[PDB]
Structures are given as structure tokens and as C-alpha cells.
């Protein structure tokens, strides 16, 4: 074990989020740093993250003592809107982007003047400003440590937020349907992905193929008795209900603060005093000497 | 056999003034000769303590049977260690007056060097009377056989007739089969050893897999039920499912190997023929076409006064290689 | 008359598996079980195209003159009929070889000039389409003397195999 | 339940002292043996005793994952007659060997190619080794989950029924 005193003296540790591997500080600097003549103006970023089960979307600004959330949305809040199955796919990413966009625009007050792109056809459209009145709320996309490929769900949530009505500056060549051999888009692939057509294509194809993998993988859709030609109506009804009731409601907890605290404290351990530590060392000395 | 000893004492080769790469290329020359047949070798005292120049002889002279290499000058076994499964059918070896033959291992490792040895240096290290029946087959095989000679004659006649009809036009499958005469069809994905002569590497029959009523291939019930054979309509469906192929039996009647028997439960007679089926044309229903591929029909026909009526109609796609008929 | 059900396919798969197990059972005491699983009353059994009459003598000569191998099953047939008790399958079997240079009974090839077995020394495999025509009463486990035809015919044997047919 | 000691990698490599037709030959050999296309490798530095300058190709290698790994491993153990020698086993828990005269591997006796040799090396692991290979939140393996020499020797002694001499 390379544990020299000189090595451990001269060793400089990195930052905490760098040692645990959760922050690229290069991109963090280039993303957070503001023009010094816009004095106290916050740069707002859209943090979109993927766990194994959930999608997180957050509007964050930065202060000296720590970050501040302006609005937030999760993929596990979709069963009050529709979707119960496939909570981390491209269509769910579009839905949670649209949800956080309508929520933030309603919270500011610009929801009735920046309606977004209703009647979505999968094209390319930046949120243009109005001739009179204000200009749209602009956010910058923050994707973190995830690689940029064509067809990724981070750009799915990007298109969801931009069609919700936030001005998020982007190009189109990382959208799934881009042809690198012609440098153009085919928006029918974008339409089918926004309505979840690849999952329906696989459902029909495996239904023609071996049904063992079908009954293993898509067993929730068989238990819910939802035909494969209903996923588009599911996504459309979810978009309508998202644009209808955008406000957030809490989970109505039973695990109150004192109850959850006392139960978790009774389950988990604690430390030991230096008096008992010196007693254990004295017992060690006595058992070693006798 | 050829003798390659004492070439450094022959005036036809001593004055020529040339040995290791010469013998390692003379192995290639003796393999490309192909009309001066030599089985054994005689190269005693070849002025090498190792076996470098005689290393490729095991691959070039794969019909080795004996070797006399006495008064050797070898003092190791690692030069001979590469001879496992190489000239392993040879049955005589002795390289005495040497540190490679006067050691201890000459009786425990020589049998490993030549497992098929019926002799060991003017002796017998194995039961050579029983080795011809234990290390090989006990009896031969029959490329064409039946319960009777006239049964084999009528079976080969109906088999060649059915193969010629399926080559010309199989549109009368509904008229060849009755209401009860059903069918079956399958394909052979996996293949044998790679050193099989002229062997198909993979079954390139990708236009016949959906209607294959094979049990352990697909895992479903309704899929094999739809791919399985009903009467005349689905029989003709299976007949036009695959690629039409003229019978390569009249070229190699030997490799077209047919067994036969009777059926006591219905007073019928069965014949299992197997030959090749090379498909120039294919199925017109919508890597894609066929390759070198074989076929085997296991029919069970019950005769009458008019003709015979089939009961089983089998189709088997396979990987084509040589047949077990030749010697 | 007939139909296309999963019963014949399951019977073909289970018969191929049970046949491979009964042929890989290398001991001599189960050589009666092969004839008892085949039609001990009356059949037609030609294994490797040999004019054999009764399965008992063939299984005895097998246990005295053949060791074990492996059987890679790659295709089956399923043909059935009505009013004839027909069920026909064809196991596409890659059958291996045994490099023990003897029969199954663990001999010593060395002529004695003066325990535990060796490694499972195998050889190159030969392809065959082993056809079994049996009776389809086994949908509720009735397989007592049902195989009317047992035709073992091959397709390709590799030159690397030890025993030469 | 999770600790299993399965096969992670089977790497086949052929190193050639020349830089002639022999590298294309061994490339066709590796593409015929494994089901994937191989990769040729450039020389690091210059030697002039091996006759090697830098930036020119020397060796060919390929990596195999999946069931073809243990298929190739069973063929190599059949060549090695299921015997290792208590070397060829790292402290980290990997093991390999080398095969002269590759004709006994299903490879035929073609003179247009000839005779080569090979090195087989097997990398072993346990489930949950993604923690050292992912990008976000990289970590380590704890000092009870690592594959060690005695664990590999006992597990792949009791399976494949092999023998480890000395």
C-alpha cells in the first residue's frame, strides 16, 4: 500500500463534487459566469438529469452561498396527467420538458403570451419574441456529464421545453431524424418519436415475433390492456392535460417530520464518546498485559 | 515409401553443394508431386539434434505408417512435442543409440505421440488384434439398403420419381397428397466440424425460415401451429415456400443415399433418401437466395392397385458437404 | 381430418431429448430400456442403415461396442395423421465421437507388458437426420411400444473423427 | 448470489517479428477464428535488433466477449489438455497461455497461410464492475469483492475439471 508520509503530506485533494464525480467545473464556470455589466442579473439554466427510474428537470440560478431552484418537474408526476408506463423514454422526456415550461411560464406570468408551438409537427422553431410588450424568458440547457449523441433524450426534453414556450437556443442536428449524408431533417421521425412511435413499432414487431420476450418486456401493457395504437392518443391527452393544469401539488405526506425523524434515528446508529474510547483502550491494554 | 537417409554421403547430392530449408521445401515438393506415392520415411541419422527440418513432414505426409530413425543424436523431447495429432497414425518408431530413445519416457510418451500405433519398435505396445475393431468401426455402412432388394428397388424408383417431379413442377402437391397426408419442414442452423470437406459454413436459406415447423428452433406454440402443415392447401404452401431445386442425385447416385423399410401398422413402406438440392430458382412469394444445400425425404407411401399414396411428407434444409457413402 | 397443434411439436422435442438421454446412457444395464421404449412388439429399426430386426440385440451390441458422445439437436419435424396413429419427427443431430479407442466399458488399450478415468477425449462430429415415426398417443404420457420406424441416416462426417465408417 | 466469477474477456494476440505478408496472413487467421475483424498494432519505439522502427505494424489482436469466449477457451484447454502449472495465474486474478502450431484449432492445413502461434489471455471479474468503467460517479471495488488468485484457481479448477500442477 503506497501510504508514505511524504506522499500524503504533499497530496492535494480535488473538490468534493470532483472526487465523487458529479460536477464538470470547466463547463460549470463557462455556464455560470455572467457579463459584469449586467450586474445582478441571473443566468438561468435548465438542469435535466436521468436516473435509472426518473427524469429530473430544474430551473436553477446561482448565488454565492449556493444554488436556487425557481421551478422543478419530475417524470414520476406524470400519472396525474396520463402516462404510467415507460417513465424514462423519449416521449416522457418531451412531456416533462413541456410540463416544466408551462409551469415556469405560468409562475412568471407569460403563459398567456408565449403559448409555445401548439399543433406540433416536429419541425424546427425557436420561440420568437412579440413585436410589443416583453420578450421571452430565456434558459440555457445544462446536460452535465452525459455525451452528446444524435437521438438523445436530453435533446428530447429540449424540444419539449422549447415547444412548451421557453426560449432555449439550439440547433437541430442532434434531433433523431437528422441525416448526416444530406444535412437535413426528416420531421416524420420527430413526430413519431414525440408521440412514441418506436415503442409501438417494437411492440407490433415482437408481437409478430416470439411472445416470450414480449410477455417478459411489455407485460405491463398487457396487464393494463392498452393496445399499441393507443400510445399516440395517450401522448396527445397528456399534452392537453399538461397545458390545462400546469400547477404543482405536493405528495400529501404521512411521514411527518418528527415521526420520520424518530423512526429513522431509531433505525440508524450513532457515535461513541471519548470516555468510552479511553475505557476500551484501557481494556485493550489490560488484556494485552494479562 | 521414400527413403531420405544419408543424402550427405551421395555424390549426386554431395557435389551439388547445398539442407534444413531444402528438406522443409522438399516436403512441399513431395506434397505437390501427387503421383509418386510414398507412405513411410527412412531418414536415420539426419545430422540434427532437433527436428526442425522434419517438422512439416507430419503435415505434408499425412499417410505415415512407420519410421526407422536409429543411431539418432537427439537429447530432448520438445522437438518431437509438436507431433501430437500429427503423423499419429504411424505404427513404428525407433531412434535408438540416442539420448532421445534411451531415456525413461520412451514407453509412456511414445503411445501419446502415436496413439494409433499397432507396434512399438519390433514389439506390440497395444492390443493390435482388437484395435482394428475398437479404435475403428466394427462393421461397414450401407449407402443403400432396405428390408428387401425389391423393396429398395421400388423405394428408389418412387424416390427418384418424386424428386424429379418436385424438380420439374411441384404444383400437384394437392394431387400427390390426400386429405390426411400432411407434411413437415425444418432447417439445420448449426454445422459440424470446420475441417469437414466442402462443408457449408452456415445455412444460407433465409427465405424459408418463417414456415419451418421445427420444435426446438422456435419457442412458441401458435407460431409452429401456423408454420405447420394442414392438408393440400398448406401442403402446397410448404411446397412453394422454399426454393425450387433440381435434384443432384443423377450426378452422384452414390452420394444420393437412401435407406428404406416397411410400415406394419398400415401395410405401407417407408424410404429415407438424402441427396443435394441446388437451387438456381427460388420461391416467387415476395443472403436472400440459397447456397450449397442438401435435402432428405423420409416418405411413407402405402401402395394400392393404381399407385402409392404418401402419409408423411418431410423437408429438411441442411449444410452441404461430402456424404458418408464413399470410401 | 388432422390439424396443427403444439402437442406434436412438444412430443417431437421431448422424444428427441429422451432419445438423446437414452443414447448417452452408456451403461449396459439400460440397454433393455431402449427396446422397451421402442416398439418391442413389431417395428422397423435401421440404425446407420443396417439390416437390424430387433432393438434388443442392437442395443446389446451398442453397449458392448459403442461409447458415449454428445448430440446437438438443431431441427425437428412434426407430421401427424388421423385413423393411422402417425407422428413423424426428424432430429437433425450432430453426433460426436469418443476417443477412448474402445467401447463404453472403460477398457485399457495398452496390451499389458509388465482407476479414475481420463479426460473426456472427444472427436469430430457427424451430422445426421435421424427419423422417428411413432404413435401419437403420448399426449397424456403413453409411449409404450409406439415407435414403428427408426431410421438413422447421416449427411456428413468429418475426416478428423477417430472411428471410420 | 452476485459473486460468480464469470468470463469477462478472452484476448487472442499474434506477435510477428516481420512486417511482411505475415501480418495480413495472421489477420485473415484471426478473422476466420473469431467472428469479428481484428486490429493490427503499431510498434512503440525502435529497436534495430528486432529490426523494428516505430509507427509500423507488428502484431494483430482481437478481443472476444460472450459465449464464444468460453467456446474458444474450451478449445484452448483441449489443446493444453486441461493443465496449467501454478504460474500463468496473476495475483490480480487473470490467466493465460500460449499455443504453438495453431492447426489443431479447427484451422485447416492450407499452405497459402501455413503455421502460426497464438496467445490466449482470460480476464475475469464479478458483477458490479461497471463502477470502475462508467463516466459519472466512478469508484472502486471494495476489498472483499475483488477477484483474487485463490478464488480464480479454485473456481476454475472445480469447473472445467482441469488440473494445476506443482
UniProtKB/Swiss-Prot annotation, chain A:
Q: Where in the cell is it found?
A: Cytoplasm; Nucleus
Q: Which InterPro entries match?
A: Rbsml_uL18_euk, Ribosomal_uL18_C_euk
Transferase as a keyword?
A: no
Q: Please give the GO cellular component terms listed in this UniProt entry.
A: cytoplasm; cytosol; cytosolic large ribosomal subunit; nucleus
Superkingdom per UniProt: Eukaryota
One GO biological-process annotation of the entry reads: cytoplasmic translation
Q: Which CDD domains does the record cross-reference, listed alphabetically?
A: Ribosomal_L18_L5e
GO MF entries:
5S rRNA binding; structural constituent of ribosome
Pfam families (UniProt xref):
Ribosomal_L18_c, Ribosomal_L5e
Print the keywords alphabetically.
Cytoplasm, Isopeptide bond, Nucleus, Phosphoprotein, Ribonucleoprotein, Ribosomal protein, RNA-binding, rRNA-binding, Ubl conjugation
Which of the residues bear the PTM Phosphoserine? Answer: 162, 171, 230
Instruction: Provide the cross-link position: Glycyl lysine isopeptide (Lys-Gly) (interchain with G-Cter in ubiquitin).
Output: 159
The family database entries (SUPFAM superfamilies) matched by this protein are listed as:
Translational machinery components (SSF53137)
Subunit structure, per the record?
A: Component of the large ribosomal subunit (LSU). Mature yeast ribosomes consist of a small (40S) and a large (60S) subunit. The 40S small subunit contains 1 molecule of ribosomal RNA (18S rRNA) and 33 different proteins (encoded by 57 genes). The large 60S subunit contains 3 rRNA molecules (25S, 5.8S and 5S rRNA) and 46 different proteins (encoded by 81 genes). Component of a hexameric 5S RNP precursor complex, composed of 5S RNA, RRS1, RPF2, RPL5, RPL11A/RPL11B and SYO1; this complex acts as a precursor for ribosome assembly.
Q: What HAMAP family does this protein map onto?
A: Ribosomal_uL18_A
Please name the PANTHER family in this protein's record.
LARGE RIBOSOMAL SUBUNIT PROTEIN UL18, RIBOSOMAL PROTEIN L5-RELATED
Q: What's this protein's family per the entry?
A: Belongs to the universal ribosomal protein uL18 family.
Name of the featured protein: Large ribosomal subunit protein uL18
State the species of origin. Answer: Saccharomyces cerevisiae (strain ATCC 204508 / S288c) (Baker's yeast)
From Swiss-Prot, chain B:
> In the record, what terms sit under GO molecular function?
mRNA binding; porin activity; RNA binding; tRNA binding; U1 snRNA binding; U2 snRNA binding; U4 snRNA binding; U5 snRNA binding
- UniProt key word Cytoplasm: yes
What is the name attached to this protein's record? mRNA export factor MEX67
In the UniProt record, does the keyword Transmembrane helix occur?
no
Gene name, per UniProt, is MEX67
An additional note in the Swiss-Prot or TrEMBL entry is: Present with 2830 molecules/cell in log phase SD medium.
The UniProt record lists the NTF2 domain at 154-317
Q: Which organism is it from?
A: Saccharomyces cerevisiae (strain ATCC 204508 / S288c)
Question: Record's family?
Answer: Belongs to the NXF family.
The cellular component terms of Gene Ontology attached to this UniProt record, alphabetical and capped at eight, are:
cytoplasm; nuclear pore; nuclear RNA export factor complex; nucleus
Question: Which residues of the complete protein appear here?
Answer: 121 to 477 of 599
UniProtKB/Swiss-Prot annotation, chain C:
An example GO BP is: tRNA processing
Subcellular location, principal? nucleus
| Any one cellular-component term (Gene Ontology) | nuclear RNA export factor complex
| Entries under InterPro entries matching the protein | NTF2-like_dom_sf, Nucl_pore_RNA_shuttling_Mtr2
Q: Which Pfam families is this protein grouped with?
A: Mtr2
Keywords attached to this Swiss-Prot or TrEMBL record, sorted alphabetically, are: Nucleus, Phosphoprotein, Transport
Q: Which domain of life is it from?
A: Eukaryota
Give the UniProt subcellular location, in the record's own words: Nucleus
> What Gene3D superfamilies would the database entry show?
3.10.450.50
Subunit structure, as described in the record = Interacts with MEX67.
Q: Per its database record, what is this protein's job?
A: Affects mRNA transport from the nucleus to the cytoplasm.
Q: What is this protein called?
A: mRNA transport regulator MTR2
Q: Which organism is it from?
A: Saccharomyces cerevisiae (strain ATCC 204508 / S288c)
The record's gene field reads MTR2
Swiss-Prot record, chain D:
| Keyword Acetylation belongs to the record | yes
Q: Which residues does this entry mark as bearing N6,N6,N6-trimethyllysine?
A: 68
Q: Which terms under GO biological process does the entry name?
A: cytoplasmic translation; ribosomal large subunit assembly; translation
* Record's keyword terms, sorted: Acetylation, Cytoplasm, Methylation, Nucleus, Ribonucleoprotein, Ribosomal protein, RNA-binding, rRNA-binding
Any keyword Transport?
no
Taxonomy, superkingdom: Eukaryota
Q: Which PROSITE patterns does the protein's record reference? A: RIBOSOMAL_L5
**Which GO cellular component term is one of those annotated?**
nucleus
> Secretion signal: which residues?
none
What the protein does?
Component of the ribosome, a large ribonucleoprotein complex responsible for the synthesis of proteins in the cell. The small ribosomal subunit (SSU) binds messenger RNAs (mRNAs) and translates the encoded message by selecting cognate aminoacyl-transfer RNA (tRNA) molecules. The large subunit (LSU) contains the ribosomal catalytic site termed the peptidyl transferase center (PTC), which catalyzes the formation of peptide bonds, thereby polymerizing the amino acids delivered by tRNAs into a polypeptide chain.
Please give the NCBIfam families that the UniProt record associates with this protein. PRK04219.1
Q: What is this protein called?
A: Large ribosomal subunit protein uL5A
> What organism is recorded for this protein?
Saccharomyces cerevisiae (strain ATCC 204508 / S288c) (Baker's yeast)
Species lineage, top-down?
A: Eukaryota, Fungi, Dikarya, Ascomycota, Saccharomycotina
